Coordinates of all heavy atoms in Angstrom, one line a residue:
Chain A
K435 N 70.6 103.0 120.0 CA 70.9 104.3 120.6 C 72.4 104.6 120.3 O 72.8 105.6 119.8 CB 70.6 104.4 122.0
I436 N 73.3 103.7 120.8 CA 74.7 104.0 120.7 C 75.2 103.9 119.3 O 76.2 104.5 118.9 CB 75.6 103.1 121.6 CG1 75.5 101.6 121.1 CG2 75.1 103.2 123.1 CD1 75.9 100.6 122.2
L437 N 74.5 103.1 118.4 CA 74.9 103.0 117.0 C 74.6 104.3 116.3 O 75.4 104.8 115.5 CB 74.1 101.9 116.4 CG 74.5 101.3 115.0 CD1 73.7 102.1 113.9 CD2 75.9 101.4 114.7
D438 N 73.5 105.0 116.6 CA 73.2 106.2 116.0 C 74.0 107.4 116.5 O 73.8 108.5 116.0 CB 71.7 106.5 116.1 CG 70.8 105.5 115.4 OD1 71.3 105.0 114.4 OD2 69.7 105.2 115.9
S439 N 74.8 107.2 117.6 CA 75.7 108.2 118.1 C 77.1 108.1 117.4 O 78.0 108.8 117.9 CB 75.8 108.1 119.6 OG 76.4 106.8 119.9
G440 N 77.2 107.4 116.3 CA 78.5 107.3 115.6 C 79.5 106.4 116.2 O 80.7 106.6 116.1
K441 N 79.0 105.3 116.8 CA 79.9 104.3 117.5 C 79.5 102.9 117.0 O 78.4 102.7 116.5 CB 79.8 104.4 119.0 CG 80.2 105.7 119.6
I442 N 80.4 102.0 117.1 CA 80.2 100.6 116.8 C 80.1 99.8 118.1 O 80.8 100.1 119.1 CB 81.3 100.0 115.9 CG1 82.7 100.3 116.5 CG2 81.2 100.5 114.5 CD1 83.9 99.7 115.7
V443 N 79.2 98.8 118.1 CA 78.8 98.0 119.3 C 78.9 96.6 119.0 O 78.8 96.1 117.9 CB 77.4 98.4 119.8
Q444 N 79.2 95.8 120.1 CA 79.3 94.4 120.1 C 78.0 93.8 120.7 O 77.8 94.1 121.9 CB 80.5 93.9 120.7 CG 81.8 94.3 120.1 CD 83.0 94.2 120.9 OE1 83.1 93.4 121.9 NE2 84.1 94.9 120.5
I445 N 77.2 93.1 120.0 CA 75.9 92.6 120.5 C 75.9 91.1 120.5 O 76.6 90.5 119.7 CB 74.7 93.2 119.6 CG1 74.9 92.8 118.1 CG2 74.7 94.7 119.7 CD1 73.8 93.3 117.2
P446 N 75.0 90.5 121.3 CA 74.9 89.0 121.3 C 74.2 88.6 120.0 O 73.1 89.1 119.7 CB 74.0 88.7 122.5 CG 73.2 90.0 122.7 CD 74.2 91.1 122.3
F447 N 74.9 87.8 119.2 CA 74.4 87.4 117.9 C 74.3 85.9 117.8 O 75.1 85.1 118.3 CB 75.4 87.9 116.8 CG 74.9 87.8 115.4 CD1 73.6 88.2 115.1 CD2 75.8 87.3 114.4 CE1 73.2 88.1 113.8 CE2 75.3 87.3 113.1 CZ 74.0 87.7 112.8
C448 N 73.2 85.5 117.0 CA 72.9 84.1 116.9 C 73.7 83.5 115.6 O 73.6 82.3 115.5 CB 71.4 83.8 116.7 SG 70.6 84.7 115.4
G449 N 74.3 84.3 114.8 CA 75.1 83.9 113.7 C 74.3 83.5 112.4 O 74.9 83.2 111.4
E450 N 72.9 83.6 112.5 CA 72.1 83.3 111.4 C 72.2 84.4 110.3 O 72.2 85.6 110.7 CB 70.7 83.0 111.8 CG 70.5 81.9 112.8 CD 71.0 80.6 112.3 OE1 70.4 80.0 111.4 OE2 72.0 80.1 112.9
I451 N 72.2 84.0 109.1 CA 72.3 84.9 108.0 C 71.0 85.7 107.9 O 71.0 86.9 107.4 CB 72.6 84.2 106.7
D452 N 69.9 85.2 108.5 CA 68.6 85.9 108.4 C 68.5 87.0 109.5 O 68.1 88.1 109.1 CB 67.5 84.9 108.7 CG 67.2 84.0 107.5 OD1 67.9 82.9 107.4 OD2 66.4 84.3 106.6
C453 N 68.9 86.7 110.7 CA 68.9 87.8 111.7 C 69.9 88.9 111.4 O 69.7 90.0 111.8 CB 69.2 87.2 113.1 SG 69.3 88.3 114.5
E454 N 70.9 88.5 110.6 CA 71.9 89.5 110.2 C 71.3 90.6 109.3 O 71.5 91.8 109.5 CB 73.1 88.9 109.5 CG 74.4 89.7 109.5 CD 75.6 88.8 109.2 OE1 75.7 87.7 109.6 OE2 76.5 89.4 108.5
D455 N 70.5 90.2 108.3 CA 69.8 91.1 107.5 C 68.7 91.9 108.2 O 68.4 93.0 107.9 CB 69.2 90.4 106.3 CG 70.1 89.3 105.7 OD1 71.3 89.7 105.4 OD2 69.6 88.2 105.4
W456 N 68.1 91.2 109.2 CA 67.0 91.9 109.9 C 67.5 93.0 110.8 O 66.8 94.1 110.9 CB 66.3 90.9 110.8 CG 65.4 91.5 111.9 CD1 64.3 92.2 111.7 CD2 65.6 91.4 113.3 NE1 63.8 92.6 112.9 CE2 64.6 92.2 113.9 CE3 66.6 90.8 114.1 CZ2 64.5 92.3 115.3 CZ3 66.5 91.0 115.5 CH2 65.4 91.7 116.1
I457 N 68.7 92.9 111.3 CA 69.3 94.0 112.1 C 69.6 95.2 111.1 O 69.2 96.3 111.4 CB 70.6 93.5 112.8 CG1 70.3 92.5 113.8 CG2 71.3 94.7 113.4 CD1 71.5 91.8 114.4
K458 N 70.2 94.9 110.0 CA 70.5 96.0 109.0 C 69.3 96.7 108.5 O 69.3 97.9 108.2 CB 71.4 95.5 107.9
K459 N 68.2 95.9 108.4 CA 66.9 96.5 108.0 C 66.3 97.3 109.1 O 65.7 98.4 108.9 CB 65.9 95.5 107.5
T460 N 66.5 96.9 110.4 CA 65.9 97.6 111.5 C 66.7 98.8 111.9 O 66.2 99.9 112.2 CB 65.7 96.6 112.7 OG1 64.9 95.5 112.4 CG2 65.1 97.4 113.9
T461 N 68.0 98.7 111.9 CA 68.9 99.8 112.4 C 68.9 101.0 111.5 O 69.4 102.1 111.9 CB 70.3 99.3 112.7 OG1 71.1 100.4 113.1 CG2 70.9 98.8 111.4
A462 N 68.4 100.8 110.2 CA 68.3 101.9 109.3 C 67.1 102.8 109.8 O 67.1 104.0 109.4 CB 68.1 101.5 107.9
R463 N 66.1 102.3 110.5 CA 65.0 103.0 111.0 C 65.1 103.1 112.5 O 64.6 102.2 113.2 CB 63.7 102.4 110.6
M474 N 70.4 103.8 105.9 CA 71.8 103.4 106.1 C 71.9 102.0 106.5 O 72.0 101.1 105.6 CB 72.4 104.3 107.2 CG 72.0 105.8 107.1 SD 72.8 106.9 108.3 CE 74.5 107.0 107.6
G475 N 71.8 101.7 107.8 CA 71.9 100.3 108.3 C 73.2 100.0 108.9 O 74.2 100.6 108.7
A476 N 73.3 98.8 109.5 CA 74.5 98.3 110.2 C 74.8 96.9 109.8 O 73.9 96.0 110.0 CB 74.5 98.5 111.7
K477 N 75.9 96.6 109.3 CA 76.3 95.2 108.8 C 77.1 94.6 110.0 O 77.5 95.2 111.0 CB 77.2 95.3 107.6 CG 76.5 96.0 106.4 CD 77.4 96.7 105.4 CE 78.5 95.7 104.8 NZ 77.8 94.7 104.0
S478 N 77.5 93.3 109.7 CA 78.4 92.6 110.6 C 79.8 93.0 110.2 O 80.1 93.0 109.0 CB 78.2 91.1 110.6 OG 78.4 90.6 109.3
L479 N 80.6 93.4 111.2 CA 82.0 93.7 110.9 C 83.0 92.5 111.1 O 83.6 92.1 110.2 CB 82.5 94.9 111.8 CG 81.5 96.0 111.8 CD1 82.0 97.1 112.7 CD2 81.3 96.5 110.4
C480 N 83.0 91.9 112.3 CA 83.7 90.7 112.6 C 83.3 90.2 113.9 O 82.9 90.9 114.8 CB 85.3 91.0 112.6 SG 85.8 91.9 114.1
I481 N 83.5 88.8 114.1 CA 83.3 88.2 115.4 C 84.7 88.4 116.1 O 85.7 87.7 115.7 CB 82.9 86.7 115.3 CG1 81.6 86.6 114.4 CG2 82.8 86.1 116.7 CD1 81.3 85.2 114.0
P482 N 84.8 89.2 117.1 CA 86.2 89.6 117.6 C 86.8 88.3 118.2 O 86.2 87.6 119.0 CB 85.9 90.7 118.6 CG 84.6 91.2 118.3 CD 83.8 90.0 117.8
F483 N 88.1 88.2 118.0 CA 88.9 87.1 118.6 C 88.9 87.4 120.1 O 89.0 86.4 120.9 CB 90.3 87.0 118.1 CG 90.4 86.6 116.6 CD1 91.6 86.7 115.9 CD2 89.3 86.0 116.0 CE1 91.7 86.3 114.6 CE2 89.4 85.5 114.7 CZ 90.6 85.7 114.0
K484 N 88.9 88.6 120.5 CA 88.9 89.0 122.0 C 87.8 90.1 122.2 O 88.1 91.3 122.1 CB 90.3 89.5 122.4 CG 91.3 88.4 122.4 CD 92.6 88.9 123.0
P485 N 86.6 89.7 122.5 CA 85.6 90.7 122.8 C 85.8 91.4 124.1 O 86.6 90.9 124.9 CB 84.2 90.0 122.7 CG 84.6 88.5 123.0 CD 86.0 88.4 122.4
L486 N 85.0 92.4 124.4 CA 85.1 93.1 125.7 C 84.5 92.3 126.8 O 85.2 92.1 127.9 CB 84.5 94.5 125.6 CG 85.1 95.4 124.5 CD1 83.9 96.1 123.8 CD2 86.0 96.4 125.1
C487 N 83.3 91.9 126.7 CA 82.6 91.2 127.8 C 82.4 89.7 127.4 O 82.2 89.4 126.3 CB 81.2 91.8 128.0 SG 81.2 93.6 128.4
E488 N 82.6 88.9 128.5 CA 82.5 87.5 128.3 C 81.0 87.1 128.3 O 80.2 87.4 129.2 CB 83.1 86.7 129.5
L489 N 80.5 86.5 127.2 CA 79.1 86.1 127.1 C 78.7 85.1 128.1 O 79.1 84.0 128.1 CB 78.9 85.5 125.7 CG 77.5 85.4 125.1 CD1 76.8 86.8 125.0 CD2 77.4 84.7 123.8
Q490 N 77.8 85.6 129.1 CA 77.4 84.7 130.1 C 76.4 83.7 129.6 O 75.6 84.0 128.7 CB 76.8 85.6 131.3 CG 75.5 86.3 130.9 CD 75.1 87.4 131.9 OE1 76.0 88.2 132.3 NE2 73.9 87.4 132.2
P491 N 76.4 82.5 130.1 CA 75.5 81.5 129.7 C 74.0 81.9 130.0 O 73.7 82.4 131.0 CB 75.8 80.2 130.5 CG 77.3 80.4 130.8 CD 77.4 81.9 131.1

Side-chain angles (χ1 to χ4, degrees), chain A residues 436-440 442 444-450 452-457 460-462 474-483 485-487 489-491:
Chain A
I436 68 196
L437 191 271
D438 296 330
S439 62
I442 50 179
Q444 298 164 18
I445 58 177
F447 191 45
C448 61
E450 302 300 292
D452 288 86
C453 178
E454 202 166 322
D455 317 314
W456 164 67
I457 297 172
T460 301
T461 179
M474 320 186 72
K477 302 151 59 66
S478 62
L479 312 180
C480 74
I481 305 167
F483 293 166
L486 301 137
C487 301
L489 194 64
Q490 61 195 49

